[PDB]
Design a protein around this nucleic acid. Structure first.
Ligand SMILES: [Cl-]
Ligand SMILES: [Zn+2]
Ligand SMILES: [Zn+2]
Ligand SMILES: [Zn+2]
Length: 116
DNA sequence: TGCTTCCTGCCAATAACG
DNA sequence: CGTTATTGGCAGGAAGCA
C-alpha cells in the first residue's frame, strides 16, 4: 500500500502508485483515495465528486456564496483565504501570515461542518 | 500574470471500539 | 462511557489553468 524510506532516522511514507512522500501516515492515507476512490465525496448541490472531503467542502461553500473571511482593516469579506490575502497584500500592503492577525475567519453557517 | 484549485503538516473534533 | 482510531478543517505556498 505504501513503503517506508528512512534517512537520518526520519521516517518517510512513500505512495506506491505516484511515489509521493509523506511525513505522516494519515496524509499518505488521505492522499491515496485519489488513486483508489474507495471513498467518494459527492457535492450535495451538483454532480461533481471529490477524492478528499475537504475539497468537497471548499467547493460547496462556493455554491452557497458565504463569505467567511473578513479583512479587519476595512471590513470587506471574501469567500476564501486566497482572495482575502490578495486583498490585504495589495490594498493594505500587509501580509496576513505575518506576526499580526489581520483577518477574521467566521464560523461556517451556510452549511453543516464541525466547528471550533 | 492573476485568478482557481490543489496539496500536506498539524491536530481538534468526531467516531469506532469494546 | 473511558480509551483508542479516524476524519477533515485550516493555513498558506504550489501547481494548474487561460
Ligand atoms: Cl456571508
Ligand atoms: Zn499517490
Ligand atoms: Zn457542486
Ligand atoms: Zn481590507
Amino acid at each position: 500500500d505504501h513503503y517506508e524510506l528512512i534517512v537520518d532516522g526520519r521516517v518517510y511514507y512513500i505512495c506506491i502508485v505516484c511515489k509521493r512522500s509523506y511525513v505522516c501516515l494519515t496524509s499518505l492515507r488521505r492522499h491515496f483515495n485519489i488513486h483508489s476512490w474507495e471513498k467518494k465525496y459527492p457535492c450535495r448541490y451538483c454532480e461533481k465528486v471529490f477524492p478528499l472531503a475537504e475539497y468537497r467542502t471548499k467547493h460547496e461553500i462556493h455554491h452557497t456564496g458565504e463569505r467567511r473571511y473578513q479583512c479587519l482593516a476595512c471590513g470587506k469579506s471574501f469567500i476564501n483565504y486566497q482572495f482575502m490575502s490578495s486583498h490585504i497584500k495589495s490594498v493594505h500592503s500587509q501580509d496576513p501570515s505575518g506576526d499580526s492577525k489581520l483577518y477574521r475567519l467566521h464560523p461556517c453557517r451556510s452549511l453543516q461542518i464541525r466547528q471550533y
